[PDB]
């Protein structure tokens, strides 16, 4: 039957703990009438673009190839800069595996996507039926309207799958911290939309024709500027680097020829991070085989933040003029950290009700989505055994 998928960026698993659900009527109703996993473990790195593609392919990042929010290809000398630069639209970055919406389009199913990062790309020669492109952070009004519009498109048969992306829980987790009232306010707004979404589904006659799946790409943890900042320019010269990508927990480095060993050994001494040669990256990350993975990768300890320098931190615009706001939450760290856990819930004719499911991994979600959408999944890294018991 029809499928509505909701991606809630940055939604940490314990945001809907038992204690939290006592004041979250929308999620409480989904929990009471559907499926909730204890938590969703993301892929490494626990960043957006990697986990977006893990969720929609069922494959680890070393397979689908989207291994960072920021990536560089030495062959073409082109960059993927968290989807902003025009070259992010190159199928080079996206053709490493076929995501579910492309498979559905090629099976002549109709797909509507709202603000979903990636829907604006021609992937493997294909695009979804409809894409409302992500431009800025969507507002809570944008979210409520997309949910209503998606239900209309599913009811009218213009869409078989509708997929909606919402960012603001991530933004407030970053700007104010995961335990902040600002983050809780953004969650409350989503909870209220979901409460009425349930009413809209019933009221428009879709309750028996529609499953709804909700998940997140990763959780969120506290960071501690300026004490817990690692300034790379205190240890190595940028002149010894061909390229550097990203700041924060996971940083990709490409040394100039002849400086690989020196950069490696110099950064090996730095406390509160780990530097890995590509061949020595922990196998459990299912990351090291990706073609875009850099010769050296830095992984910060939880709560620490790697940057070129303090003055080069990603300050945010909390005021009119220059960006001076400190970030208070972040993610990207070791994907087995409790704070990096995300969520998965489901409700509808094909899911059990009031069912607490064991924790699953980001790679497990694709098989579920494909099953209830009625399409054969492409071979992937999900475990059917880890998810099968939530289905009716
Ligand atoms: C915009 O932010 C600056 C920087 O201060 C950061 O301090 C943290 C509390 C963090 O939450 C982050 O949001 C915030 O941006 C604010 O200036 C700072 O104000 C504090 C007291 O609130 C002073 O102790 C600091 O000395 C001062 N630092 C600087 C560089 O000004 C600023 O108030 C804020 N602007 C607005 C309009 O709120
Ligand atoms: C997916 O995108 C890649 C990147 O554009 C395509 O491969 C490139 O294009 C041609 C294919 O032979 C070559 O000249 C390039 O060297 C390729 N670059 C690579 C492979 O990194 C690929 O063909 C696309 N696949 C589909 C099905 O459209
Ligand atoms: C994750 O799944 C992918 C896709 O099924 C696996 O990659 C395939 O592995 C077989 C066996 O070596 C190859 O014949 C295919 O060509 C591979 N496909 C791709 C797209 O790479 C991969 O081995 C799985 N990873 C793990 C850790 O189980
Ligand atoms: C990629 N994005 C800009 C749409 C969302 C935020 O990215 P991320 O901080 O969750 O990795
Ligand atoms: Zn995210
Ligand atoms: Zn984020």
Numbering used by the authors: 24 to 415
Task: Reproduce text from the manuscript describing this model.
The ecto-nucleotide pyrophosphatases/phosphodiesterases (ENPPs or NPPs) family consists of seven structurally-related ecto-enzymes. Here, we showed that GPC is hydrolyzed to phosphocholine by ENPP6, which is present on the extracellular surface of certain cells such as oligodendrocytes and liver sinusoid endothelial cells. Together, these results strongly suggest that ENPP6 serves as a choline-supplying enzyme.
An electron density corresponding to the bound phosphocholine was observed in the vicinity of the zinc ions in the catalytic pocket. Tyr72, Tyr75 and Tyr188 provide π-cation interactions with the positively-charged choline moiety. Furthermore, Asp32 and Glu190 electrostatically interact with the choline moiety. Tyr72 forms a water-mediated hydrogen bond with Glu143, while Tyr75/Tyr188 and Tyr157 form direct hydrogen bonds with Asp32 and Glu190, respectively, thereby stabilizing the conformation of the choline-binding pocket. In addition, Trp139 and Pro140 in the “insertion loop” (residues 139–157) interact with the side chains of Tyr72, Tyr75, Tyr157 and Tyr188. The conformation of the “insertion loop” is stabilized by a disulfide linkage between Cys142 and Cys154. The Y72A, Y75A, Y188A and E190A mutants exhibited the remarkably reduced α-GPC-hydrolyzing activities, as compared with the wild-type and C393A/C412S mutant proteins, confirming the importance of Tyr72, Tyr75, Tyr188 and Glu190 for choline recognition. The crystal structure of the ENPP6–phosphocholine complex showed that ENPP6 recognizes the choline moiety of phosphocholine, which strongly supports the idea that ENPP6 recognizes the choline moiety of its substrates, such as GPC and LPC, and hydrolyzes them to produce phosphocholine in a similar manner.
